PDB file of C-alpha atoms in Angstrom:
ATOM      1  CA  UNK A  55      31.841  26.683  28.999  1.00  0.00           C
ATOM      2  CA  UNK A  56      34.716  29.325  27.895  1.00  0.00           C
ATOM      3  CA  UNK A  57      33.911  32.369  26.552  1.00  0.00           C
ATOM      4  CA  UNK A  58      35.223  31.247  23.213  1.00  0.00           C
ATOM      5  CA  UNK A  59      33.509  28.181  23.457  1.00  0.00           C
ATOM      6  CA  UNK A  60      30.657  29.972  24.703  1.00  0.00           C
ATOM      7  CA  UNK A  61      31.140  32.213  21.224  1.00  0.00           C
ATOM      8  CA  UNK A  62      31.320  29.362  19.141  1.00  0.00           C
ATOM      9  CA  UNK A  63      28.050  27.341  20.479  1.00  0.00           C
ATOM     10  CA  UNK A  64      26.206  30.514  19.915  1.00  0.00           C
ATOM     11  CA  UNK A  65      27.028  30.801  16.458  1.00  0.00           C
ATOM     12  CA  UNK A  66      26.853  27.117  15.570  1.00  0.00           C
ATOM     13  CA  UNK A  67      23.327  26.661  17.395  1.00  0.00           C
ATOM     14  CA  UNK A  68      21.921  29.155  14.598  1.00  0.00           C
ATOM     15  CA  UNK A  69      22.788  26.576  11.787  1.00  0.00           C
ATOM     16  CA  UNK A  70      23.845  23.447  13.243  1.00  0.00           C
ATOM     17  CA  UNK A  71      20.287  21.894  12.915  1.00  0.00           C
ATOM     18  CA  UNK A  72      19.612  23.569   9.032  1.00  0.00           C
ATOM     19  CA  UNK A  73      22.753  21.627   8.134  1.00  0.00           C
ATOM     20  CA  UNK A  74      22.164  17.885   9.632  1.00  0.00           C
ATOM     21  CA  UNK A  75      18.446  18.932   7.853  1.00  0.00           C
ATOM     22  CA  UNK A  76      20.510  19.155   4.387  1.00  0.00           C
ATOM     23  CA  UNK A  77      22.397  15.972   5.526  1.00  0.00           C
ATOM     24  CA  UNK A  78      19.767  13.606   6.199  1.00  0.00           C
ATOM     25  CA  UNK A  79      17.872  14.987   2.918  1.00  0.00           C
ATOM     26  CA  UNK A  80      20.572  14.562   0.706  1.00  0.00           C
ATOM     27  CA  UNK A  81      20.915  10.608   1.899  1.00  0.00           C
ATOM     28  CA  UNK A  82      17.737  10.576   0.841  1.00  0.00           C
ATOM     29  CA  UNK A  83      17.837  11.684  -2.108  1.00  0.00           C
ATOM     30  CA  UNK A  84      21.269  10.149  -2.772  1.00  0.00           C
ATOM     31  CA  UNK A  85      19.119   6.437  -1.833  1.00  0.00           C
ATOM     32  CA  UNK A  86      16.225   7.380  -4.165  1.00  0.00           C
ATOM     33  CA  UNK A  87      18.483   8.474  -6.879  1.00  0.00           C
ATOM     34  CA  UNK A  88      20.326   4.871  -6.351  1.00  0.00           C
ATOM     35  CA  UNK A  89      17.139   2.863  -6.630  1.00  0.00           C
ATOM     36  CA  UNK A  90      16.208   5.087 -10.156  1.00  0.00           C
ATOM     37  CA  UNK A  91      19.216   3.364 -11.519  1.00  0.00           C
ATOM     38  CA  UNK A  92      18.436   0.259 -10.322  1.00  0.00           C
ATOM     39  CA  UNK A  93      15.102   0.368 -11.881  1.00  0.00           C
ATOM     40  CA  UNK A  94      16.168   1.568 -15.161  1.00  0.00           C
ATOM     41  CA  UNK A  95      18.591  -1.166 -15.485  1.00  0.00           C
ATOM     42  CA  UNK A  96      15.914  -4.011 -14.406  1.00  0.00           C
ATOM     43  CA  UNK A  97      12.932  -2.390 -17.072  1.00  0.00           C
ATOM     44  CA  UNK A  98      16.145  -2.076 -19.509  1.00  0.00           C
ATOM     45  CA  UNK A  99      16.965  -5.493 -19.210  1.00  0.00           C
ATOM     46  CA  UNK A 100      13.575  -6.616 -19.268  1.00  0.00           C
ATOM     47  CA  UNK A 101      13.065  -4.455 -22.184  1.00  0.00           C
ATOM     48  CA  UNK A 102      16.633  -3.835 -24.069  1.00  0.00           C
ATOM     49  CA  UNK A 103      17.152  -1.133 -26.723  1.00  0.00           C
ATOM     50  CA  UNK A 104      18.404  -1.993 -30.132  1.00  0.00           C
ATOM     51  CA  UNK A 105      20.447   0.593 -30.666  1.00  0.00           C
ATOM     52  CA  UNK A 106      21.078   3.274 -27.077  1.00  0.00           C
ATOM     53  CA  UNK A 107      20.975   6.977 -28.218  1.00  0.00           C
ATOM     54  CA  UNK A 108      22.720   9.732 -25.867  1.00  0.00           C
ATOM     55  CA  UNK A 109      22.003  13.227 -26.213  1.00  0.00           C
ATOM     56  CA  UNK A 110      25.384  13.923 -27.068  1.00  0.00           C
ATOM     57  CA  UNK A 111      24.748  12.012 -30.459  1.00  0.00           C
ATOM     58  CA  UNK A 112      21.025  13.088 -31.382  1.00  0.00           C
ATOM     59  CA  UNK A 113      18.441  14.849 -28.161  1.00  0.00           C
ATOM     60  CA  UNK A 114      14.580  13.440 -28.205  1.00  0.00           C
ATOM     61  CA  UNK A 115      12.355  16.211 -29.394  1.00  0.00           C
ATOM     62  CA  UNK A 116      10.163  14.874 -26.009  1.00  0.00           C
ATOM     63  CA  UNK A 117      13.481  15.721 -24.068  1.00  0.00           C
ATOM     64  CA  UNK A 118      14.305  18.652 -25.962  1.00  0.00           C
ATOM     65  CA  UNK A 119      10.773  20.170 -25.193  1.00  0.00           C
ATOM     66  CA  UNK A 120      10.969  18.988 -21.396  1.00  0.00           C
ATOM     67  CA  UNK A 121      13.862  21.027 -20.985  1.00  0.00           C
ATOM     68  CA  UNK A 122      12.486  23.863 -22.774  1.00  0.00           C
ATOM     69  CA  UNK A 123       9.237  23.885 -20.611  1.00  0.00           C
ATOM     70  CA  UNK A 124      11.322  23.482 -17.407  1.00  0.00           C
ATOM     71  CA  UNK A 125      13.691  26.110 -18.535  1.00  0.00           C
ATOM     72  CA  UNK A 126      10.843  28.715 -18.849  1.00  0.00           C
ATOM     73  CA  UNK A 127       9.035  26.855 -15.544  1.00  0.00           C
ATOM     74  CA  UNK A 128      12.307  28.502 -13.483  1.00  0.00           C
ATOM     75  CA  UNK A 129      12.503  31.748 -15.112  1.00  0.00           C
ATOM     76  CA  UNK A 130       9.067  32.586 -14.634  1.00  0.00           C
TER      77      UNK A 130
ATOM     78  CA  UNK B  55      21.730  43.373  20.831  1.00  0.00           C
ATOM     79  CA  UNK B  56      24.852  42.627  22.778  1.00  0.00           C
ATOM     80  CA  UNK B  57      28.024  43.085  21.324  1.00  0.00           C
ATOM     81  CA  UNK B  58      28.719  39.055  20.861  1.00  0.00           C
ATOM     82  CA  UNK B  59      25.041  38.794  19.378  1.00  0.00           C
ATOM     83  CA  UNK B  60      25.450  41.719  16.966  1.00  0.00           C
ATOM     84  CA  UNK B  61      28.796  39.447  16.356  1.00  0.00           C
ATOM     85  CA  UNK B  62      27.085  36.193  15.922  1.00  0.00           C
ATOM     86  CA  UNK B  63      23.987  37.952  14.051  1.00  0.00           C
ATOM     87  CA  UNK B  64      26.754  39.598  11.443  1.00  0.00           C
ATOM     88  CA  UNK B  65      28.491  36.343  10.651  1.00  0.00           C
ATOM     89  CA  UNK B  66      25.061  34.437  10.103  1.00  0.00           C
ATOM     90  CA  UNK B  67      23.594  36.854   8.071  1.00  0.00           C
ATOM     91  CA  UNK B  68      26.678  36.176   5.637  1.00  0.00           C
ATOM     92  CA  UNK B  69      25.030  32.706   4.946  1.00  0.00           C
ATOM     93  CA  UNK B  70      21.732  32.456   6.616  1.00  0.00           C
ATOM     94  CA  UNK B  71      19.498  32.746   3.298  1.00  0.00           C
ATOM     95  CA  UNK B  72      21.722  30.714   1.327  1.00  0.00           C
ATOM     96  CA  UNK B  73      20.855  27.507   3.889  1.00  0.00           C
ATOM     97  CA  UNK B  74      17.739  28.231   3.438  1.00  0.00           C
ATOM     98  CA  UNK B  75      17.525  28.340  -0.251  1.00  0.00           C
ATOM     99  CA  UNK B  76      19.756  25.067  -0.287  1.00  0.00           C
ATOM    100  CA  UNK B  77      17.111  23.226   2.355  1.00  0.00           C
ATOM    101  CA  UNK B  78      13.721  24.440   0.817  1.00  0.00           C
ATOM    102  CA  UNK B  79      15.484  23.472  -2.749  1.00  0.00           C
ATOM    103  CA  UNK B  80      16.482  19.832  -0.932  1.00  0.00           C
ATOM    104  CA  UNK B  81      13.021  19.458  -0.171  1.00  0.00           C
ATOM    105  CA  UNK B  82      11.640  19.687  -3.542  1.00  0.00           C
ATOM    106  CA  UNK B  83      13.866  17.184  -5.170  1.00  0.00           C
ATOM    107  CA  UNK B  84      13.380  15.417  -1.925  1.00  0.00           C
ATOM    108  CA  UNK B  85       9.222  15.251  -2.801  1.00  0.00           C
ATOM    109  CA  UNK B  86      10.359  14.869  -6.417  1.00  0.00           C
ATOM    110  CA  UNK B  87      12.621  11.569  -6.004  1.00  0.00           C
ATOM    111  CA  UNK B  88       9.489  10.387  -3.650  1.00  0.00           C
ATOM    112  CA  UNK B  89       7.112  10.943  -6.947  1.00  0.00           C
ATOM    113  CA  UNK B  90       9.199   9.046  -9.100  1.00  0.00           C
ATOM    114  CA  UNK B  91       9.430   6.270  -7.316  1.00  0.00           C
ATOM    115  CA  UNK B  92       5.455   5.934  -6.732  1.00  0.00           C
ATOM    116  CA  UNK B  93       5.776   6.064 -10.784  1.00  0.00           C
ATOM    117  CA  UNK B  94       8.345   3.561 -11.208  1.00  0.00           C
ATOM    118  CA  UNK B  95       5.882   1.510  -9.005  1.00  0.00           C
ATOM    119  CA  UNK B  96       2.833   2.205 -11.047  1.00  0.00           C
ATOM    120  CA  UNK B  97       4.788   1.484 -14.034  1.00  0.00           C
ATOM    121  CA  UNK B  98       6.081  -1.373 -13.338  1.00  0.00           C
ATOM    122  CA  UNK B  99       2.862  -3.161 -11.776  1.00  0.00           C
ATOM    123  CA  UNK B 100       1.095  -2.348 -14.866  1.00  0.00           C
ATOM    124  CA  UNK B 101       3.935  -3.412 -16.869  1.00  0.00           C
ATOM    125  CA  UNK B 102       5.629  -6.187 -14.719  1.00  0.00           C
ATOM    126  CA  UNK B 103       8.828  -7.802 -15.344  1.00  0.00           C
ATOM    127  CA  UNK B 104       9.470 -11.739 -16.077  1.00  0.00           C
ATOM    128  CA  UNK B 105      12.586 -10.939 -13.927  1.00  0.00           C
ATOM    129  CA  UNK B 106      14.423  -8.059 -12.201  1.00  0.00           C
ATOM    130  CA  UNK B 107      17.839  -7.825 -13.196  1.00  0.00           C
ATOM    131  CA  UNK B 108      20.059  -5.677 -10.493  1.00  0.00           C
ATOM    132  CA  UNK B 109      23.520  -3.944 -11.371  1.00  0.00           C
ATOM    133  CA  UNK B 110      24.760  -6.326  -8.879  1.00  0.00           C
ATOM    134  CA  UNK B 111      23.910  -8.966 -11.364  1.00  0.00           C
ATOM    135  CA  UNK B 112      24.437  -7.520 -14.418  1.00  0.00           C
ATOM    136  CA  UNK B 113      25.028  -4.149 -15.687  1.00  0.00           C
ATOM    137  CA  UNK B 114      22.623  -3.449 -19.039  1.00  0.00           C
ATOM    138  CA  UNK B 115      24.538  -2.371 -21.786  1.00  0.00           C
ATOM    139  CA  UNK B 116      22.923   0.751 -22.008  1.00  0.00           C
ATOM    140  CA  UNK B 117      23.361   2.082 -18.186  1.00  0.00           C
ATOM    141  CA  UNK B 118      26.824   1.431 -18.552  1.00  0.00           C
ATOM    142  CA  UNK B 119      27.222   3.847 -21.759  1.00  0.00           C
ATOM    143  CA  UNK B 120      25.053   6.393 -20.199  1.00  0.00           C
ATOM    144  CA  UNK B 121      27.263   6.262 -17.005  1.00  0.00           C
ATOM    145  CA  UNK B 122      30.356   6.385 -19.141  1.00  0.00           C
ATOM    146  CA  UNK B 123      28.956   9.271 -21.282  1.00  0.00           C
ATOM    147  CA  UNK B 124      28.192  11.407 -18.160  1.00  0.00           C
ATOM    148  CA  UNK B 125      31.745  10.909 -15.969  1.00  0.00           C
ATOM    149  CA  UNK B 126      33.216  11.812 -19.234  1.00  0.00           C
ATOM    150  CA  UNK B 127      30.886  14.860 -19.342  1.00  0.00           C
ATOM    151  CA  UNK B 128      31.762  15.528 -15.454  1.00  0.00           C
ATOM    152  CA  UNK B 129      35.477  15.537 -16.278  1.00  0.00           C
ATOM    153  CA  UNK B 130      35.158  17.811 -19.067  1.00  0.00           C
TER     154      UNK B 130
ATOM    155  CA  UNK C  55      47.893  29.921  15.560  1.00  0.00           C
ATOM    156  CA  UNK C  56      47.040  32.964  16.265  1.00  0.00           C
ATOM    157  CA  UNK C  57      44.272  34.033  18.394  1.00  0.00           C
ATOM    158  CA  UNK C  58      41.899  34.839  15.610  1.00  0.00           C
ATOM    159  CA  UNK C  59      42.974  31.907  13.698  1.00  0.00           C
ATOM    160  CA  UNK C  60      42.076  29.170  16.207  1.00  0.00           C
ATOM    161  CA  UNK C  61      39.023  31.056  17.011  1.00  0.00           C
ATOM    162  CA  UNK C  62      38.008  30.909  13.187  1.00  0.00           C
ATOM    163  CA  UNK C  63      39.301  27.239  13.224  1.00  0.00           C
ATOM    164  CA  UNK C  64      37.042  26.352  16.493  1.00  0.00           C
ATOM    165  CA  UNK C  65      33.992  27.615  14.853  1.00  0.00           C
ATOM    166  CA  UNK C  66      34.600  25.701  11.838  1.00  0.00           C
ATOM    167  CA  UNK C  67      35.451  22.449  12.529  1.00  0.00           C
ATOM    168  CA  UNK C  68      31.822  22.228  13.916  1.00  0.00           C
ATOM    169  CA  UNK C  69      30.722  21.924  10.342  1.00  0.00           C
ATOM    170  CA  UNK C  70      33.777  21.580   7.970  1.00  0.00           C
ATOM    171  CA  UNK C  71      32.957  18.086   7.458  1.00  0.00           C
ATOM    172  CA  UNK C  72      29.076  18.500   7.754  1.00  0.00           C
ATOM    173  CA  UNK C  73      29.867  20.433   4.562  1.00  0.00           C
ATOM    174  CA  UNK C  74      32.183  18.211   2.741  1.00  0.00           C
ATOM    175  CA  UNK C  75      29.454  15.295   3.144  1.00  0.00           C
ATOM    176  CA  UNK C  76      26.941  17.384   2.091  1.00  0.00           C
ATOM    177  CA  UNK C  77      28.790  18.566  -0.916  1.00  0.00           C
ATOM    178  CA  UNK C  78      29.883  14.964  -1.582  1.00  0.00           C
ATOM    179  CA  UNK C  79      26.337  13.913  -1.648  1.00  0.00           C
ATOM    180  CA  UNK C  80      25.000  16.413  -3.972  1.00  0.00           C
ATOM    181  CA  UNK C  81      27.888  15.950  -6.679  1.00  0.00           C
ATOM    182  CA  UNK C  82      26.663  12.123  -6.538  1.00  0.00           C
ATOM    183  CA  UNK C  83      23.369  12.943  -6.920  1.00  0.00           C
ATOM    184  CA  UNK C  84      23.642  15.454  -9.517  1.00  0.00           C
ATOM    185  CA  UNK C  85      25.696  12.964 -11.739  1.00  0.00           C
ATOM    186  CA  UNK C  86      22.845  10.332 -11.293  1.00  0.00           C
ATOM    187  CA  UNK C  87      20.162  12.828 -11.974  1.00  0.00           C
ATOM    188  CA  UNK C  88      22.468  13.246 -15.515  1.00  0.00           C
ATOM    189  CA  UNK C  89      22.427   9.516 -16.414  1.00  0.00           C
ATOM    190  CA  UNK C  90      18.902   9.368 -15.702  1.00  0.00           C
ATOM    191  CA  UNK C  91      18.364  11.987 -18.497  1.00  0.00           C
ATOM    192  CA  UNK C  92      20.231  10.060 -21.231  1.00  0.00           C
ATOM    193  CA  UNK C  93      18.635   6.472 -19.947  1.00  0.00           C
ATOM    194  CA  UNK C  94      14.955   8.660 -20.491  1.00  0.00           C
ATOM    195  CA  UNK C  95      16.883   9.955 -24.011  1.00  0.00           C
ATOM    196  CA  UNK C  96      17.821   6.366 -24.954  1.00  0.00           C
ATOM    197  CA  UNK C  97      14.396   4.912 -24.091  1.00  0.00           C
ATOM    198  CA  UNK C  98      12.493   7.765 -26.067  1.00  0.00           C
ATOM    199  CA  UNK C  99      14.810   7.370 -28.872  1.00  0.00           C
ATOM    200  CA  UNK C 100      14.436   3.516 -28.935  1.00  0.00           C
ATOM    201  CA  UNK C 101      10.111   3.989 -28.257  1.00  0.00           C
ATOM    202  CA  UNK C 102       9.273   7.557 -29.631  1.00  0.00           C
ATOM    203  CA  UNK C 103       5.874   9.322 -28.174  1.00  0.00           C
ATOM    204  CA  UNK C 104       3.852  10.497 -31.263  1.00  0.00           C
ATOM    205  CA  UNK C 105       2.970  13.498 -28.976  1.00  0.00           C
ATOM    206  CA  UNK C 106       4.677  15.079 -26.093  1.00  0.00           C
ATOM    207  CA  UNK C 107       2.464  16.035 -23.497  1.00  0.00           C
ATOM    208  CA  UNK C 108       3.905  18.330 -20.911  1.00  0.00           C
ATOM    209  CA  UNK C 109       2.324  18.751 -17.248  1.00  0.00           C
ATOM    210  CA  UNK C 110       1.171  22.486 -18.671  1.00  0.00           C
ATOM    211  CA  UNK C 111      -1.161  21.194 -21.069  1.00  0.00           C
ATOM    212  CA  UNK C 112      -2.561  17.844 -19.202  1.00  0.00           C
ATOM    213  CA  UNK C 113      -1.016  15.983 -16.147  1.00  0.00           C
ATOM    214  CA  UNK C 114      -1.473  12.524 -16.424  1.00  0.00           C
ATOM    215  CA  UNK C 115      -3.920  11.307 -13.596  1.00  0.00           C
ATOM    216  CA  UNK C 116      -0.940   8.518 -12.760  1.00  0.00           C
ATOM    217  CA  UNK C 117       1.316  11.657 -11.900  1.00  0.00           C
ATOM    218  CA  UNK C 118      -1.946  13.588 -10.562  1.00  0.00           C
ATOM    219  CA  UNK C 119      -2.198  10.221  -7.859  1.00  0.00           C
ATOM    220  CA  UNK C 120       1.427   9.962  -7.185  1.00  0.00           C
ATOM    221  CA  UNK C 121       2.125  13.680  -6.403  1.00  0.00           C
ATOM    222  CA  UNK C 122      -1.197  13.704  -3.884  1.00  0.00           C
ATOM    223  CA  UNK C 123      -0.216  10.571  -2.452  1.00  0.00           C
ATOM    224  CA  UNK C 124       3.415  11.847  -1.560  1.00  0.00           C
ATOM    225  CA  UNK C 125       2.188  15.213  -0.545  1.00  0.00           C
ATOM    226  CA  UNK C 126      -0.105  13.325   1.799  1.00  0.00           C
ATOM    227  CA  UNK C 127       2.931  11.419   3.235  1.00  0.00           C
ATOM    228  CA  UNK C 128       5.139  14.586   3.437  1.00  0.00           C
ATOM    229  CA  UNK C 129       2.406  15.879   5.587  1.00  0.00           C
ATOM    230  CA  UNK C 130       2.031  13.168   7.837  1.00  0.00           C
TER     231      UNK C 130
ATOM    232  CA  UNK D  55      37.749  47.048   7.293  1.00  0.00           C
ATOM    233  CA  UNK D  56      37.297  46.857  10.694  1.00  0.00           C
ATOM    234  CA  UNK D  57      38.215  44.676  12.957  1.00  0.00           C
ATOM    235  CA  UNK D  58      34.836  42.425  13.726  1.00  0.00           C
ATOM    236  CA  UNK D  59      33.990  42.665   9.553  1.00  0.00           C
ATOM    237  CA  UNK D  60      37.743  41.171   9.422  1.00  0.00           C
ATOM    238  CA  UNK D  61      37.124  38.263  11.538  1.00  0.00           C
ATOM    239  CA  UNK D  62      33.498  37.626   9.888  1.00  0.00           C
ATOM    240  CA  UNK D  63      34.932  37.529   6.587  1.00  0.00           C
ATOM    241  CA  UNK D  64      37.902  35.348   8.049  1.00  0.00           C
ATOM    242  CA  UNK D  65      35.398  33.353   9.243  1.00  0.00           C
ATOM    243  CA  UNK D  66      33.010  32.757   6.020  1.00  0.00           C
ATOM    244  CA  UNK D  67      36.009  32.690   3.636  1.00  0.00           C
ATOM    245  CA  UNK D  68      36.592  28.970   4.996  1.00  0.00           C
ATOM    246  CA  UNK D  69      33.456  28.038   3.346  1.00  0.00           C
ATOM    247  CA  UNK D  70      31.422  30.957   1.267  1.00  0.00           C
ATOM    248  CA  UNK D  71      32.869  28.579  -1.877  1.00  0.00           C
ATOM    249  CA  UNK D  72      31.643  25.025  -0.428  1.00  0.00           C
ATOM    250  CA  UNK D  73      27.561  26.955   0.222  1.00  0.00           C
ATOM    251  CA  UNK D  74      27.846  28.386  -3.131  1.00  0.00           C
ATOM    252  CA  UNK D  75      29.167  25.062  -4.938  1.00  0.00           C
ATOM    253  CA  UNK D  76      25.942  23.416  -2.870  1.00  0.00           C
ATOM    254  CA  UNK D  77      23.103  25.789  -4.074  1.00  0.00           C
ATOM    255  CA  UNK D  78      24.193  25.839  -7.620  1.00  0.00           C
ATOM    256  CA  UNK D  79      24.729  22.082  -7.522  1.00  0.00           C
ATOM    257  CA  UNK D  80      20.753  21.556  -6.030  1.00  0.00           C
ATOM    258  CA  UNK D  81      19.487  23.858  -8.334  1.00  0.00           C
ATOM    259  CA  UNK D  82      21.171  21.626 -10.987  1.00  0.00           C
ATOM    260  CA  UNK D  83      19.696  18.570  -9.742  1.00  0.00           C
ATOM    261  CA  UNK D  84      16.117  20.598  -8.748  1.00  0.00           C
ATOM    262  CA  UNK D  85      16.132  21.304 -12.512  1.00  0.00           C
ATOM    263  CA  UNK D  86      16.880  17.787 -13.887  1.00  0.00           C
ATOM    264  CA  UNK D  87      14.182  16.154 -11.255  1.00  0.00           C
ATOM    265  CA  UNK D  88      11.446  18.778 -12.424  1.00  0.00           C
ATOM    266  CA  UNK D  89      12.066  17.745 -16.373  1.00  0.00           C
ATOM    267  CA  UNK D  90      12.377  13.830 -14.641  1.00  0.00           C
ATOM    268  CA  UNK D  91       8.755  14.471 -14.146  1.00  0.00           C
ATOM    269  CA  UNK D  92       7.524  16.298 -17.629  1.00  0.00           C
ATOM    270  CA  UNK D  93       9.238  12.724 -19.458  1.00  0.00           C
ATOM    271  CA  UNK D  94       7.313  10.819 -17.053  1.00  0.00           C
ATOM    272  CA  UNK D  95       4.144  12.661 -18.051  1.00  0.00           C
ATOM    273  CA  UNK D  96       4.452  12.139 -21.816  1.00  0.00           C
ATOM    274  CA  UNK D  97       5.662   8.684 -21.092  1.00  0.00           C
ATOM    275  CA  UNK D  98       2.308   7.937 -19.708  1.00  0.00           C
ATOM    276  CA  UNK D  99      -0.092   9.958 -21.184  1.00  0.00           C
ATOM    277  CA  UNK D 100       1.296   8.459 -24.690  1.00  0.00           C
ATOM    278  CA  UNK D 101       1.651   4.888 -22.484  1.00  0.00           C
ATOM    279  CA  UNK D 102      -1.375   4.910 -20.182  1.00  0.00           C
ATOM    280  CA  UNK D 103      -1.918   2.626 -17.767  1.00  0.00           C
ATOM    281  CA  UNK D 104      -5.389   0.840 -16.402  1.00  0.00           C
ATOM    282  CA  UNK D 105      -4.673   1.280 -12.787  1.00  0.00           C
ATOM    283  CA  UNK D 106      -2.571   3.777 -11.132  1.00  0.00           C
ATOM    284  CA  UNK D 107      -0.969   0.741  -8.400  1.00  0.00           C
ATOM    285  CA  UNK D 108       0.929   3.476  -6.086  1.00  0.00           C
ATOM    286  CA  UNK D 109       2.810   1.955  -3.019  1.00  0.00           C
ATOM    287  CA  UNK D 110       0.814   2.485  -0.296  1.00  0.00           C
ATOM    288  CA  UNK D 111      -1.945  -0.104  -2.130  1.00  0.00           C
ATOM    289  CA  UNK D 112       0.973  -2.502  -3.595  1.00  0.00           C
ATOM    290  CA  UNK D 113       4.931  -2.294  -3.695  1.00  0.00           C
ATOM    291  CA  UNK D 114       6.301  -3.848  -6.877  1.00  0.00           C
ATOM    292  CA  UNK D 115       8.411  -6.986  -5.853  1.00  0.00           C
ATOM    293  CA  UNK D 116      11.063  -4.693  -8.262  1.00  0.00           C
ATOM    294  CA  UNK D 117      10.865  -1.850  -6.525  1.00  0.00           C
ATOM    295  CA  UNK D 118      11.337  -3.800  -3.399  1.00  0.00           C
ATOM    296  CA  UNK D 119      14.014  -5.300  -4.588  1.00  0.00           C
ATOM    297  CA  UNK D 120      15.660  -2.584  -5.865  1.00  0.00           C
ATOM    298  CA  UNK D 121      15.107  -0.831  -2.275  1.00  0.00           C
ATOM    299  CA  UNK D 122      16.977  -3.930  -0.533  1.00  0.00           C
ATOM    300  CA  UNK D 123      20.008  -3.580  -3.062  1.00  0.00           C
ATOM    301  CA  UNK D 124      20.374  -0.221  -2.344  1.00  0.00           C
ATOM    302  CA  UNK D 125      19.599  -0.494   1.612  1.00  0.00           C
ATOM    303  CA  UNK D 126      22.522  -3.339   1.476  1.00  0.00           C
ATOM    304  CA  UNK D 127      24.978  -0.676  -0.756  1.00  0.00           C
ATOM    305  CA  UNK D 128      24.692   1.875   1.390  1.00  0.00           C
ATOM    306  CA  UNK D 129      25.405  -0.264   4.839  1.00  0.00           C
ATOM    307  CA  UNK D 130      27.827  -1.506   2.998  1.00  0.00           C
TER     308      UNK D 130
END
């Protein structure tokens, strides 16, 4: 190789497999993520709401205190 | 070190711990996404469905105002 | 260019669009991991809980079984 | 600064902002999957069900084909 090429291999080979790591997780989780929604919208259809509540109109208390407890989960 | 691994060692060390975070942090939701699914499956053998209705098919009501709730959310 | 600019260039068009992907990825993600929330808001809302029970006071045995059962597959 | 610190910061200037983006966008979704998990707790200790069915024993014909839609999305 070059020297600069040389250079840049060196620095790249103390990454380069962390980030195709990150990659091929995110897919992953990017594919799961897809299939949640999937799933919600077969059980919703199976099971349809009368009326469908976002948070941005009234929270759950059961979401409201899932947040809370995950909340204090991270800062502890 | 050399000099052009005391180079190489300076720029990683700019970034090294933040990969890290970001792939042990991937992991986790990784292993989380994995655990909902095996719950979706529970679920939904315990509580099957007469029929599985895909977004491909049709789109419940209530998916699409949740996804219309949160790119509105995302651009504000 | 100049030197030092085509150097920096070199080393990053290693990963530039290793990046990009993986930032891609995680926005989509993170706005699916949103509309999850408000489909779990919705449901609640539509099929309330009389109690919230949080994983700090009792963990389910379904969600005791699905978190050994992935942490068994993670391992192998 | 000196001359090496000038390059290194040349260097991580290209993408110091895409990393940081990254991590604060996992944590995000790291968050949202851990409270994913305290809904899906209440859900079921509130909802419980006989048998735990997880998918190493039996895969939902919905979660299978949920899996295949997505599979076919993302070759597609």
């Amino acid at each position: 190789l070059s020297e600069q090429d040389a250079l840049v291999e060196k620095i790249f080979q103390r990454f380069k497999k962390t980030l195709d790591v990150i990659r091929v997780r995110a897919g992953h989780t990017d594919k799961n993520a897809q299939i949640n929604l999937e799933l919600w919208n077969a059980f919703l259809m199976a099971n349809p709401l009368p009326v469908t509540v976002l948070t941005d109109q009234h929270t759950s208390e059961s979401v409201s205190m899932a947040k809370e407890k995950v909340s204090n989960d991270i800062a502890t």
